[PDB]
Amino acid sequence: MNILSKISSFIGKTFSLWAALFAAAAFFAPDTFKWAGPYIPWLLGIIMFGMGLTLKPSDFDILFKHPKVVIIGVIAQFAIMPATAWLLSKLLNLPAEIAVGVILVGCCPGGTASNVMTYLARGNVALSVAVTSVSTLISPLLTPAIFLMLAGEMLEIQAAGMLMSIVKMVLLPIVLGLIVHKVLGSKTEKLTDALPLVSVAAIVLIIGAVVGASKGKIMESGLLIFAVVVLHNGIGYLLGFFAAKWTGLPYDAQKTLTIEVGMQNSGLAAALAAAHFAAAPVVAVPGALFSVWHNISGSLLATYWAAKAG
């Protein structure tokens, strides 16, 4: 069974219980998220382990047979979102450590959630999986590279350390997912049945941990960070659509790259912020809020297209 049909079905069927569990957790057991703070890199690693657990060599066919459509998506990813974050930081003159967190999100690759949103938007799913996989696999070099170029003068770099952080949090769990898939063969369908549950649980723990650990600066700047997230996410959609349109790509691919650009692996941003900016928790907040908003705006954008398709 397609993992994207498993994920959307799981969310659509239990979105209420998650909203109630988070609510009761943040109010009657705030420790649930504070205790998970030091495990944000592992929680993300679990998410990426899922991507690798479901990735098959067939998902790269469109790359090897239609390289130019995939190359456009990867270029549009790293050409739009890093620069967009930098511009929003300067035009709004954000605090230094908030701008670093916003730029950090922009320099990350596309989000793994775009595959489901493209599936829900009825775009080119094969393209969505390809661009996200390519951008993710080359992010150990591009994400720290672009990140220091756009925010170098704002803080220390440790670009080499961030590369290894992405290798351990992204490449290694993906590789583990691939070999676990090879070892178990068909028995992996039962492990992927629990992937929607495990992934969502990890996603909410990461968000609540970052939020709860930075509630002082969220009170005074949280609304400003959300606004930046909405604009960053929205501008990515707009430019991702006009990028696919102006290059002459079909409508299904225009929806794919629209979702691909605007949506980010904001969990990686939060994990990198926790590992390389631990003494400045606010650096991780843009990734936490982005992780929330882009799934809201993504599903809403998919719903709009789903309605116009009739």
Ligand X SMILES: CC(C)(CO)[C@@H](O)C(=O)[O-]
Least distance (Å) between residue 115 CB and ligand X: 9
Within 8 A by CB and 6+ apart from 117, the residues are 259, 263, 295, 298, 299, 301, 302
Q: Taking CB under 5 A as the rule, does residue 132 contact Na ion?
A: yes
- Binding residue per annotation — 265? yes
Q: List the single partner that 132 binds among Na ion, ligand X, none, CB under 5 to 8 Å by kind.
A: Na ion
Separation between Cα atoms, residue 72 and residue 130, nearest integer Å? 11
Residues in region 27-56 near ligand X by CB under 6 A: 47
Residues in region 184-223 near ligand X by CB under 6 A: 203
Residues in region 262-291 near Na ion by CB under 5 A: 264
- Binding residue per annotation — 267? yes
Report which of 141, 102, 44, 71 is spatially closest to residue 236, judged by C-alpha positions: 102
Q: Annotate each residue in 86-125 with x if it binds ligand X (CB under 6 A) or - if it does not, as one string.
A: -------------------------xxx------------
Least distance (Å) between residue 270 CB and ligand X: 8
Least distance (Å) between residue 31 CB and Na ion: 33
Cα within 13 Å of Cα(298), Cβ side: 32
Q: List the single partner that 121 binds among ligand X, Na ion, none, CB under 5 to 8 Å by kind.
A: none
Within 8 A by CB and 6+ apart from 124, the residues are 118, 250, 252, 253, 255, 256
- Which of residues 54, 295, 297, 299 is near ligand X by CB under 6 A? 295
- Binding residue per annotation — 115? no
- Binding residue per annotation — 14? no
The 3-state secondary structure of 75-108, one letter per residue: HHHHHHHHHHHHHHHHHCCCCHHHHHHHHHHHHC
Question: What DSSP letter does each residue of 168-197 carry, written as one string?
Answer: IIIIHHHHHHHHHHHHHGGGHHHHHHTHHH
Q: List the single partner that 254 binds among Na ion, ligand X, none, CB under 5 to 8 Å by kind.
A: none
105 close to 232: Cβ distance less than 8 angstroms: yes
Could you tell me which stretch among 26-34, 56-64, 122-130, 297-305 binds Na ion (CB under 5 A)?
A: 122-130
Q: Taking CB under 6 A as the rule, does residue 299 contact ligand X?
A: no
Q: Taking CB under 6 A as the rule, does residue 174 contact ligand X?
A: no
Identity of the residue, 128 or 143, whose beta carbon is nearer to Na ion in the bound complex: 128
Could you tell me which stretch among 14-22, 61-69, 121-129, 263-271 binds ligand X (CB under 6 A)?
A: 263-271
Q: How many residues bind Na ion (CB under 5 A)?
A: 7
- Where helices occur in the chain by DSSP H, the ranges are 3-28, 31-34, 40-54, 61-65, 67-91, 96-107, 114-121, 125-137, 139-151, 159-166, 172-184, 188-193, 195-212, 215-246, 251-262, 266-276, 285-308
Q: Taking CB under 5 A as the rule, does residue 82 contact Na ion?
A: no
Give helix 172-184 / helix 40-54 axis angle, nearest 10°. 40
Contact footprint for Na ion (CB under 5 A): 110, 114-115, 128, 132, 261, 264
Name the binding residues: 112-113, 265, 267, 295
Contact footprint for ligand X (CB under 6 A): 47, 111-113, 203, 265-268, 291, 295
Name the binding residues for (R)-pantoate: 112-113, 265, 267, 295
